[PDB]
Amino acid sequence: LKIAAFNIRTFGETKMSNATLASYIVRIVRRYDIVLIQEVRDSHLVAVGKLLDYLNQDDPNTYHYVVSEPLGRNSYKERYLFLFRPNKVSVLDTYQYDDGCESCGNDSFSREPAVVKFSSHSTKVKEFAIVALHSAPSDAVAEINSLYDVYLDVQQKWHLNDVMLMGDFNADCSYVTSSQWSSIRLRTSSTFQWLIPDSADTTATSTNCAYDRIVVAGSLLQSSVVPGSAAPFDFQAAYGLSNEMALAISDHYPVEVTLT
């Protein structure tokens, strides 16, 4: 099972209408059995529907979706979108973290995590949850720390220790410095393995930053990870692209991992 989290800069109608950018995005998505797409700025789900139209043009059930409403604390809103291959995994339940009141999710996250429970019969782990987060850069330390509370919420809600938490956490550089890691319970708790290391470059731009991350909890799930499989997917190199064409797709690389 191949899983990825991909921040596609301003993913939306204009990007999906560009046949060239759409073709590269389709090619990227088709690598994966589950992929989380972030930065979905798509007021009427038109770009999402167009991506699904391409993915499903041959077989109507190639990919199924889980998508959120627009999220953000002010007028600037983004959705989380999961695309998954239903012949590989099945969605058993979903919810949006809300911390106890209909608005309180926004007290700790700008974009309240989407949480999806999957049944996965081909991997060692048979059921596992994925928690998506695109953090607010200026609140990264506090939001990554709050994922620890999301993890606790999953355990209590679903009685399940096998959880992957992933996305553009902005977890490096000026937004999380080396000294700040000790403030983040998701990092200091031995419950979690960070599969994308601080040394990784997950930007398509000239910064060298491990912004995007995959964190796994639960021993079954941890035992399911293929060693060395977790890494950014440098699509500029993969597809022999110019840097300008690369940046037009996104300013981030997907981060991916394989489960057996």
Partner: peptide, 8 residues
Amino acid sequence: RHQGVMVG
């Protein structure tokens, strides 16, 4: 047009 759900 496609199979899936809104979160929650």
